[PDB]
Structures are given as C-alpha cells and as structure tokens.
Amino acid sequence: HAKNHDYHILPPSIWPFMASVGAFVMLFGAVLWMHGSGPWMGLIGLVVVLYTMFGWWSDVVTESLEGDHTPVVRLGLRWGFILFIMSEVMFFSAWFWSFFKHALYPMGPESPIIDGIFPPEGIITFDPWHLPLINTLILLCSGCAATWAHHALVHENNRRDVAWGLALAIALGALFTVFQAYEYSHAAFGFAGNIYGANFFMATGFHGFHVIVGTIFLLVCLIRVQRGHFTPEKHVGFEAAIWYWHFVDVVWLFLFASIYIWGQ
Amino acid sequence: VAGSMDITQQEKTFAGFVRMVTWAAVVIVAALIFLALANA
Amino acid sequence: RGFFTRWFMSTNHKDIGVLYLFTGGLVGLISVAFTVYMRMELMAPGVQFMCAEHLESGLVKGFFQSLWPSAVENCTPNGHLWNVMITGHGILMMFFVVIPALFGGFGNYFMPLHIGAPDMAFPRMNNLSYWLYVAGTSLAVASLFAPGGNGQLGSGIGWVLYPPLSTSESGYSTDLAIFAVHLSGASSILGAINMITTFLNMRAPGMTMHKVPLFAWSIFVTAWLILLALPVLAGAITMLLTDRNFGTTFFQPSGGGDPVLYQHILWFFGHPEVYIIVLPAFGIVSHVIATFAKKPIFGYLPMVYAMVAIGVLGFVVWAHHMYTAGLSLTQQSYFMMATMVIAVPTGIKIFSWIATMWGGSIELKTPMLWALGFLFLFTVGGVTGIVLSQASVDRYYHDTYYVVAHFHYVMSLGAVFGIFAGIYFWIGKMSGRQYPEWAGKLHFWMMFVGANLTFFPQHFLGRQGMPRRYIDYPEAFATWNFVSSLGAFLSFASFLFFLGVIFYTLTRGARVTANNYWNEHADTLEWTLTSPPPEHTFEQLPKREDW
Amino acid sequence: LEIIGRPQPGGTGFQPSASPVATQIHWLDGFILVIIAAITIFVTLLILYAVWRFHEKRNKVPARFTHNSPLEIAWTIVPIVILVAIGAFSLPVLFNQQEIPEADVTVKVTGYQWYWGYEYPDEEISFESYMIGSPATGGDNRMSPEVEQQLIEAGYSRDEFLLATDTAMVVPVNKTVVVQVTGADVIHSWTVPAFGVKQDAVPGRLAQLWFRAEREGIFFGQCSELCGISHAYMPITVKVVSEEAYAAWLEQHH
Numbered sequence A: 001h002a003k004n005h006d007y008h009i010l011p012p013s014i015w016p017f018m019a020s021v022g023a024f025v026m027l028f029g030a031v032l033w034m035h036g037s038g039p040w041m042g043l044i045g046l047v048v049v050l051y052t053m054f055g056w057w058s059d060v061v062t063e064s065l066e067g068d069h070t071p072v073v074r075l076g077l078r079w080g081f082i083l084f085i086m087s088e089v090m091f092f093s094a095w096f097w098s099f100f101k102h103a104l105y106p107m108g109p110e111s112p113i114i115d116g117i118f119p120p121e122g123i124i125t126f127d128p129w130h131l132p133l134i135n136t137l138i139l140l141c142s143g144c145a146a147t148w149a150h151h152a153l154v155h156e157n158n159r160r161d162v163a164w165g166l167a168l169a170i171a172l173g174a175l176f177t178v179f180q181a182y183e184y185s186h187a188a189f190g191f192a193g194n195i196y197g198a199n200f201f202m203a204t205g206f207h208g209f210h211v212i213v214g215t216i217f218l219l220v221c222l223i224r225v226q227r228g229h230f231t232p233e234k235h236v237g238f239e240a241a242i243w244y245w246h247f248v249d250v251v252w253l254f255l256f257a258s259i260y261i262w263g264q
Numbered sequence B: 001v002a003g004s005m006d007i008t009q010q011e012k013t014f015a016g017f018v019r020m021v022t023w024a025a026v027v028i029v030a031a032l033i034f035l036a037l038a039n040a
Numbered sequence C: 001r002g003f004f005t006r007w008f009m010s011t012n013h014k015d016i017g018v019l020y021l022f023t024g025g026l027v028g029l030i031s032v033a034f035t036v037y038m039r040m041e042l043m044a045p046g047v048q049f050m051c052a053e054h055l056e057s058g059l060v061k062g063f064f065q066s067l068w069p070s071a072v073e074n075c076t077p078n079g080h081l082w083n084v085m086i087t088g089h090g091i092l093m094m095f096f097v098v099i100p101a102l103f104g105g106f107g108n109y110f111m112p113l114h115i116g117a118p119d120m121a122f123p124r125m126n127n128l129s130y131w132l133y134v135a136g137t138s139l140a141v142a143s144l145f146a147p148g149g150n151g152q153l154g155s156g157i158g159w160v161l162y163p164p165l166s167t168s169e170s171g172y173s174t175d176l177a178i179f180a181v182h183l184s185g186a187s188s189i190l191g192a193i194n195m196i197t198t199f200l201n202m203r204a205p206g207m208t209m210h211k212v213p214l215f216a217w218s219i220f221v222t223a224w225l226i227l228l229a230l231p232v233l234a235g236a237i238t239m240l241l242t243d244r245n246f247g248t249t250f251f252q253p254s255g256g257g258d259p260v261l262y263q264h265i266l267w268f269f270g271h272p273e274v275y276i277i278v279l280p281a282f283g284i285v286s287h288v289i290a291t292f293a294k295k296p297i298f299g300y301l302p303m304v305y306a307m308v309a310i311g312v313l314g315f316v317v318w319a320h321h322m323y324t325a326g327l328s329l330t331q332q333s334y335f336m337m338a339t340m341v342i343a344v345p346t347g348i349k350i351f352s353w354i355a356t357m358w359g360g361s362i363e364l365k366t367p368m369l370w371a372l373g374f375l376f377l378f379t380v381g382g383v384t385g386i387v388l389s390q391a392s393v394d395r396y397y398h399d400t401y402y403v404v405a406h407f408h409y410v411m412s413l414g415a416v417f418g419i420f421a422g423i424y425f426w427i428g429k430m431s432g433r434q435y436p437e438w439a440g441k442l443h444f445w446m447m448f449v450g451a452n453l454t455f456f457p458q459h460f461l462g463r464q465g466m467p468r469r470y471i472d473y474p475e476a477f478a479t480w481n482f483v484s485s486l487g488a489f490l491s492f493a494s495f496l497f498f499l500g501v502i503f504y505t506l507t508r509g510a511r512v513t514a515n516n517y518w519n520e521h522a523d524t525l526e527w528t529l530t531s532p533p534p535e536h537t538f539e540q541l542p543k544r545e546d547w
Numbered sequence D: 001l002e003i004i005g006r007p008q009p010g011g012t013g014f015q016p017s018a019s020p021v022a023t024q025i026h027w028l029d030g031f032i033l034v035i036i037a038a039i040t041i042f043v044t045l046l047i048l049y050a051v052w053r054f055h056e057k058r059n060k061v062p063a064r065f066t067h068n069s070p071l072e073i074a075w076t077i078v079p080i081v082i083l084v085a086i087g088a089f090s091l092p093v094l095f096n097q098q099e100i101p102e103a104d105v106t107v108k109v110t111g112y113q114w115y116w117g118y119e120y121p122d123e124e125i126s127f128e129s130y131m132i133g134s135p136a137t138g139g140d141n142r143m144s145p146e147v148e149q150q151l152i153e154a155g156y157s158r159d160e161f162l163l164a165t166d167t168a169m170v171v172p173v174n175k176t177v178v179v180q181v182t183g184a185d186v187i188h189s190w191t192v193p194a195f196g197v198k199q200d201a202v203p204g205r206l207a208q209l210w211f212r213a214e215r216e217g218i219f220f221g222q223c224s225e226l227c228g229i230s231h232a233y234m235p236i237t238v239k240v241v242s243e244e245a246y247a248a249w250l251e252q253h254h
C-alpha cells in the first residue's frame, strides 16, 4: 500500500527454517555415519535440504516471472553471487596454501631446519600432459560452449545456439567429472596417510564437487531455455551460471599449473 | 510505479566495486609473487 | 501474523535482528554460567567441584553434585571436564554469542534503517542465516553431551581446535563441534553477503557512502572481514575432519603433516575473527558518544578509514598467535612489526571518541556510561596488546593468564559493553518501553566494578607465570585467583540483574511517547520513525532533507 | 637447593631472573610498562576531566568542531614514535633470544602426554620427569598424605606440590645450554620462567632455545599448551649446580 521504491519485499517463507532443521540433521547424521551407525539419518537430512533448496530456487524464478526482479533487484542479485564467488575463492585458497606449503617446505626428519623431498619420496605423480591436459581441453572447450550460449541470448536473441551451446557445455562438464573419476581410480598413491594424497584428493576433490554443482546449475538454466525463460535484458540466473562456470575454469587452470605442471 | 526507480547512484557504485575488487585482487597476487620472489 | 509465521518464517529484518539479540543473550547466559563454574573451581587451589567421583552418578545426578564442593581427599581431579568447560565457554562466545548479538542482532535491525532501506537485499536468505545459526548452536550444545575425550562427554580441545590433540581426541563430540562451527560460518557468510549488498545497493537517494552513518560503516567492514575470513576457517576445520574421520595426515607428522600449518590457516581466520567481534561495537560507541555528548562525531572520514585500515591490516598480522610455536626469526620479526602498525589506527579511534566528548554537553545517561566504560577497558586492554606484540616479551607471557586478561579487557568486555550500550540506547526504539534509568546505571556500575576485579588480578597471575587451561595451580597464586573469582561472581549477578531489568522493561516498562526519546543529537534515520517502527519501514523512500 | 624459579603467594611482578635473556625480558617489560602506564593514565584523566568540564550542567551548549588537521597528525606521529622507540629496543632482545649460539650442554627435550623426556646426546643420558604427584608416582595428580611425604623425599616442601617433579634436568652455571624441543604425542610446551625461555613441543619439528644459567638453585616451569586431561600435571624442574658438582652427576646417571 503506497510505495515508490523498486526493492523486492518478500512474503514470509518456511524454507529458511525448514532447511536448517534438515541441515542440522544431515550433519548430525553424517557424524554418526562416520562413526559406524546407519547413513539413514544423514540422508534424510540431505533429502530435506535438497528438497528445500529446490523449493527456494523455484520461487526465485516464480518471482522473476512475477515481475519482482526490477533493475535494482537484478543488480543486487548480481553482487550477491559475486560476493559468494569471492568467498568461494577464499575457501579454495586454504587448500592452495596447504599444498604450496607442503610443496615448497615439505616435512623432513629435521623439519624446520632442513626440509625434505618434494614430491614425497616414492610418490609417483600424474603425467601433466597425458590425461590432465585432456581435462584441461574438456573444460576450456565447455567454457567456450557456455560463453557462446551467453553471447547468443544477450547479443543475438538466438534461442537455438543458447540451448545448443548449453547442452554441449553440460555434456563436457559431466564428461570432466567422468574422466576425472578415472584419474582417481588410476591414482598412483593413496588418500590416507600421506600429505600429497591429502593435498591432491582434497583440492581436486572439492573442485570436482564444484564442477558437479556448476553442471547441475547450467542444466537448470538449459531446462529454463527449454521453457523459454530468459530475455536479453533479464537473465540473472543465466548470468551467474556462466560466472560460476568461468570461476570453476580459473580454479582448474590454477590447479593444473599448480599441482600438475609446477608440482609434478 | 515499479520499474521506474533511478539507479544512477547504484550503477556507479557497482562499476566502482568491480573496478575496486579487480584492482585489489591483482595487488594480492603481486604481493604473493613478491613474497615468493623474496623469501621462498 | 501468528507466533510461528512471525518468528519461524520472518523476512522482516527487524524481527530477525530481534531473534539474534535474544538468542545471543540465551547462549551468553549458558556460556556465562560456564564461567561462573570455572571461577568457582579456580576460587582456591585443589579440585573440589570437578571430581572424577561425580562421574559414577548419572548425567542429571552427577551434574547437581558437581555444583557443590568436596574435600581434596574425596576429589580425584577430572581435568577433562575443566577442558570441556573452557572449550565450551570459548566456542559458544566466539561463534554463538557476541558476533550474533552485534552483527546478527543490532546489525540486521538498524543498518537498513540507517541507510534508509525498506528491507535487506536478500531478506529470505537473511532468515536462513539465523536458523543456520540455531542449527550450529544445537550441534555445539550436542558436542557437550556426546561421546568425547578420555571416555567422557564433551570435547576439551580449546576454542581453536589445535591438532594433533583435536584430531586424536576420541569420540565424535569434536566432529559435532566441527560441523557446529561450519554452520556458524555458513550463517555469517550469508549474513555478510546480505549486508554488503544491502549497504552498497539499497542506500537512500542522495546518501553517498561518505554520508552513511558510522554504525552502518562498522557493520559494512565487519561483513567484508566475515566474507573473506570464515571461508578460510572452513578449510582449516575440514582438514581436521578428514584427519579425524578419513585418516588423512594434514597435521599428523608420521604421514608428513605439520600441526603448525593448521595454526597459520586457523589464525588467518582467527584475528579477523576478533576484529569481527569489536568492529560493530566501534560503531555503536560512535553513535552513543555523539548522541550524549550532543556533538557531531569527531573526524568522520578518518574514523571510517581507520576501520578500513584495521580491516585490511587485520589479515596480515595473524602469526603473532604463534610466536612460541617455532617460527623463523624473519617471520616473527615481520609479524611483530605488522602487529605494531595495526595498533596505530586502533589507537587513533580512542582519541576521536575523547575529542567528540571535548566541547560537547554530556548527558551521562546509561548508554553514555557503557560507551565511556568501553573507552577505558579498550585502552586497558589495548595497551597490554602492545606488550604482547613484542615477540621478546611474548615468550614469558604467552599461554599465561596475562593473555586471558588482555583479550577479556579488549574483546570480551569491549564487545559486551558494546552490546549493553546498544541495548539501553535502542531498547525503547525496539520495544516501545523504556528501561528504568536507576537500574541501568546500577547494572553498569556493578559490571564495571566486578569485571575489573575479575580480569585485572589475572594480569598478575600471568606475570607470576600461571599458564592457560590449568584446572589447578600452585598454592602460590591463590590470592589473586580468589580476587578474580569474587569479581566474576559479582559480575554474574550484574548480568542476572540485567535479565531482570529487561524483563521488567519488556512488560512493566514505561511506554515511550515520541519517535526520538533521547535528544536532538540522536540524529540518524531510526529516530525519525515511530518508537516501535512500522512493520514495513521506508515504504516511501526518505528524501535527502531527512538526514 | 635454593628454590628460585617459583611463584610467591600473591606476587604481582615477574619470577626471579636467572639468565641474561630473562634480565632483558624483565627490562623490556619495565620500559613498556612506563609507556603503557602513562597512556592509560593520560586517557583516563582526559576522559574524567572531559566528563566533568563538559557536563551539560557545567557547560550548556555543545561545540561545533569536527576536525583538527594539526592535532590529528600529533595523534599519529606520537604513537608511531612511541612504537619505533619500543621497537628499537625489542628487536635486539628478540634476535638475541632466537639466534642460537655454541652449546656447552646440548639437551633434547621431548613432550609426552603428561610427562617429559630429556636426552643428553653427548653424555649418553636419558630419563623422564614425572610430577611428584603423578599416577606414575602413585598419586592421583592431587595432594594426599602419601604425596606430601614424597615431596619431602626429593628435598621439596608441601609448598612446591604442582611444580616439583620426580626427576630434574640438571645444568652447570655460566654454561650455554641449548635445549632442543620436539613433541611426541600432541603439542606440549617447555618453559622455565626464571630462564625466560618458552618453546612449543610440536610433533615433527626440531625447535631450539638457549639459556645461560647465571645463578644456582632449583627453577620450575609448567607445560604451556593444552595437551589433554593432565595438561596441568606435567611440570619442569631444572636444578643448576657448579661445574664441579655437575661433573660428578654426569658420571653418576650413566
């Protein structure tokens, strides 16, 4: 009743409360799963959360189709995602720190005085050109496929290449994690009991979790192109997809030139 | 009158925020490249 | 419009902020109760309350037995409980009490008002930050009643979860605490993202950032620290989680780990963390001193840029928590000097507040007392920091109650005074009922007397060599430990009295007439709105002439 | 036999010096303590006076000023000088206590959950220092009739309960002991307040301190990093004796 501002005001919503009940149970049940009892309490949580996330984000489309995403709101949603991406970079930095330390000054039997050998004695690394470069061409190509999709909708309004490009990107994205899940099978070293395995499998591990996320995210954007949901002016969800995906590429390119090239 | 609102102050602030964060990010990458070229 | 839809589904920031305030009080009281029991044992040497014998009774039983002493002959010292209490105290306070009441509680309420915003940028995600915070607090409480170390309940690691002790302490209680901290970060990061966007995108027309109220700036800087620090802590504790439960060797040396690398990564979060606590108090104190000294806050910009300066430098001084851990002399040198740089802008702000009082007409009402009290404690606390900054002297002082005294003066009492200053200042403006000025001024004075006789005696114990996390000490300390445990007991009564004062105020309280109930110089946008402000504030955006 | 490194029942200053580094830590703290004692007194009086001189009763109308470009630079240059002052005397004391010299004695100290371990690599000696109230020395990590008699045994009082250990690291006066420290279980920390040395025992790191013992007597120190249930109950005793007496011990312990 009687307002002059464009800012999005929201009706009350269960999902904040419902997600945090599920998330508490997810993480409590995971603790118990990690200590011998049944995964069931954990996966109840995962389902309640994944159900809540779904509900949540379905309304952020409903509202955008409802004409709530005004100029400012859309702009604000762009910062929100960038600030998020920045804190994603800060998360990964803790793992590049952990790697670069145990690479520059690896632990030797006379540790702070005289450092040890890197890569650890008897750790056979991956050939940085055989397979990892296949995955670096898988991702760099998928990053082009998703950018042609952006440039299509934004600067051509060409809905065919938007859909086509995204399908190719989602394909190569899921292909990366498939090809990477082979590099894990064919790993010349263990996960437990050595730092190299600890630094390697956790750093590429989280990146792979971020690729899985970025591919699911791109698929939600394609599913929406199937329903013809974006316009050249209004496409914040599609915008953040290509940002997030390009962020994943930067992370891999670092990993490649850190763990594989420089750290072989 | 939704859609009408004047954004000039905010769109300016966003260009600064982008210009700022990009600048800040290279300084830090440079600072670590210095620190590595100094005391690695 | 029902108790559930209003508080379990709110998207109105004013309510979510109120939720934060009240939960912060609740978890506070829990954690303050931990400290009254802690000083109870430390009252005089020998263990009397934390006896292994009490374990043979059940949970409820052995509890109420522990609340009442014993003879040194009938008491086997259970150090584990002691460690879980000190850990319980710290973790609750640093992750679930003080930041939530300042950043979550006041920050969510007033920062949108100060900048003339109708809501927050992402007010549905806002609610998620609160309920994730409750989820963390649950997991945190669960950690106290869980398969823990040395065959008992609870994790007795210390609020910073140092390894290999953390990684190898038995049970799963620690893993809960890990995930509790995970969610407390997830809360904060979302809250921060909201605050940053809100501040940058939703200001009033004509309000440039150099026209933004100081509290809003203080919250804005706090949000940036949170945005960048907490994700680093996530990695830190995830590495503890995989060492504990997936047998990696991030910090296990037999596999090639370095327990020192944890401290780097943790304290890379750990200092920003301590500036995330006090920075909102800087703002609140700025607003209060300017109001009740009837004088525009001395040196606006500088003040801000000081906050920016502190905020930037806060990341690159982290290793002065590690002077003893075995750091290269080159390193120890750098962190000694950088730590000294921070001291300058953190000092300067103390002067600006005095300069605001200089010249003005000072109404010594309750909020002004608390802000004045803060000034004292923040100096007393800050100067002992200069001592510790010099690595040479740190060797003697490190891991002694001298540090405990330092960080209580500057951080605990600093932020607590910040919180109370906020509460009395804004209670009418949030409830519609004012507090009784006699009770407030009493609560302040009890706290100020008690809390000084609590932690200043601890300075001595540190110089006398009493180390941290000791359930028992040589008899040759007990003089000061009794002085402290007295003050701490008195302090507990003050916080109890306060809980009454607000109970009186929220029910039997003097309903507030006007929009502004303080004086003309409480001149920011919240005092333009109704005393309990409308459920939808700034439907009509305020025109430039409104500030 | 003169118990020196020790708390006094309600003391406020440091523990007695016993080394050149512990003299300089006593000195630096005093120098700083003047400067901090000034700054708090100066801030307290500025606060008190302003509250009196500028109370709404004692002064009716507030002032209008907000900035003072001269005085504000005064507010900055002074603490930078104050810190350059303290810094100039503190960086020397830091290098001195961290640059290790030639060792007269070398000792390796190892942190074990709730006891210590000393090695003299040269003189071929090894032993473990448990607290006199230990469960390895019968006690429940508490005082009891039995536990007091044992304190007398080693030449200690009921006073020294939580400080006195069943075996001591013994050292020659005016000889530079280089103490190397590592942890075995979790992180422990070796300190002797009288000697002015603290070094964390981190598993998997060879960390080093040094102290030149100037006086003779018994010195104490307790563990300074939370290490588990009995973190209070693993202290340090360093008996320092004359070179003649120490040469007699170095054959005995063999």
Ligand code: HEA
Pocket (backbone or CB within 6 Å): C274, C275, C277, C278, C320, C321, C323, C339, C340, C342, C343, C344, C346, C347, C348, C350, C351, C378, C379, C380, C381, C382, C383, C384, C385, C386, C387, C388, C389, C390, C394, C397, C398, C399, C403, C406, C407, C410, C411, C412, C414, D039, D079, D080, D082, D083
């Ligand atoms: C509220 C947060 C806060 C603030 C503001 C501070 C203000 C400072 N504090 Fe610290 N402190 C912590 C939260 C804070 N700190 C916490 C939580 C811990 C412990 C965690 C744990 O160990 O468990 C800690 C422990 C700590 C240590 C390590 C002790 C140890 O464990 O060995 C050191 C040493 O470098 C230190 C230095 C400082 C310095 C140099 C300043 C200075 O920047 C202060 C500025 C000076 C003042 C505020 C006094 C007023 C001065 C003026 C008005 C003019 C300025 C004068 C000069 C520059 C000479 N702090």
Ligand code: HEA
Pocket (backbone or CB within 6 Å): C021, C022, C024, C025, C026, C028, C029, C031, C032, C035, C036, C038, C039, C086, C087, C089, C090, C091, C093, C094, C097, C098, C101, C157, C158, C159, C160, C404, C408, C411, C412, C413, C415, C416, C419, C451, C454, C467, C468, C469, C470, C471, C488, C491, C492, C495
């Ligand atoms: C900033 C948060 C905070 C707060 C508020 C405090 C309030 C107090 N703490 Fe501090 N404490 C720490 C952060 C705090 N503490 C940390 C992080 C550690 C490290 C754990 C470790 O060593 O590993 C520590 C360790 C510590 C120890 C020693 C443990 C050991 O070394 O073995 C002791 C005992 O002397 C201590 C005494 C007190 C007392 C008596 C109070 C108070 O009870 C006294 C007076 C103050 C009040 C009564 C204010 C209470 C009010 C609030 C908290 C506001 C609540 C919210 C609202 C009203 C909205 N604390």
Ligand SMILES: CCCCCCCCCCCCCCCCCC(=O)OC[C@H](COP(=O)(O)OCCN)OC(=O)CCCCCCCCCCCCCCCCC
Pocket (backbone or CB within 6 Å): A089, A090, A092, A093, A096, A097, A098, A100, A101, A104, A105, A112, A113, A115, A250, A251, A254, B024, B025, B026, B028, B029, B032, C264, C327, C328, C331
């Ligand atoms: C845009 C997306 C990009 C992808 C995201 C990844 C970005 C992160 C990349 C940089 C990561 C930092 C890596 C730093 C590792 C340095 C190695 C190290 O740990 O130093 C070791 C030192 C202690 O070693 P010590 O044992 O004492 O040495 C004894 C001598 N033998 O310990 C030290 O002294 C610490 C050295 C200082 C290191 C500080 C690290 C801070 C981490 C913040 C990085 C954030 C990057 C932000 C960039 C902007 C991005 C937009």
Ligand SMILES: CCCCCCCCCCCCCCCCCC(=O)OC[C@H](COP(=O)(O)OCCN)OC(=O)CCCCCCCCCCCCCCCCC
Pocket (backbone or CB within 6 Å): A100, A250, A253, A254, A257, B028, B029, B031, B032, B033, B035, B036, B037, B039, B040, C312, C315, C316, C328, C330, C331, C334
């Ligand atoms: C995508 C395509 C890829 C293409 C690649 C091209 C991009 C290149 C990027 C390279 C960056 C890699 C980062 C590696 C940095 C290594 C850091 C380092 O070497 O410093 C460690 C050093 C070691 O310590 P020390 O024991 O004293 O050494 C003695 C032995 N000589 O530590 C010291 O010197 C001790 C002094 C400590 C100083 C700490 C300084 C603070 C850290 C910097 C600030 C960062 C914090 C972020 C700030 C955010 C807030 C604004």
Ligand SMILES: CCCCCCCCCCCCO[C@H]1O[C@H](CO)[C@@H](O[C@H]2O[C@H](CO)[C@@H](O)[C@H](O)[C@H]2O)[C@H](O)[C@H]1O
Pocket (backbone or CB within 6 Å): A184, A185, A186, A187, A188, A189, A190, A191, A192, A201, A202, A204, A205, A206, A209
């Ligand atoms: C949800 C969040 C996701 C982020 C976390 C990422 C988790 C990534 C998990 C990686 C799983 C590691 O799996 C790992 O198991 C085995 C034992 O350690 C390894 O080792 C195996 O091959 C090696 C052959 O030389 C041998 O050393 C081992 O005897 C053999 O068991 C595998 O080669 C490796 O792939």
Ligand SMILES: [Ca+2]
Pocket (backbone or CB within 6 Å): C040, C041, C042, C043, C044, C045, C046, C047, C048, C471, C472
């Ligand atoms: Ca006791």
Ligand SMILES: [Cu+]
Pocket (backbone or CB within 6 Å): C270, C271, C317, C318, C320, C321
């Ligand atoms: Cu710090």
Ligand SMILES: [Cu+]
Pocket (backbone or CB within 6 Å): D111, D112, D113, D114, D187, D188, D189, D223, D224, D225, D226, D227, D231, D234
């Ligand atoms: Cu120990």
Ligand SMILES: [Cu+]
Pocket (backbone or CB within 6 Å): D187, D188, D189, D223, D224, D225, D226, D227, D228, D231, D232
């Ligand atoms: Cu210990």
Ligand SMILES: [Mg+2]
Pocket (backbone or CB within 6 Å): C324, C325, C398, C399, D200, D224, D225
């Ligand atoms: Mg320590």
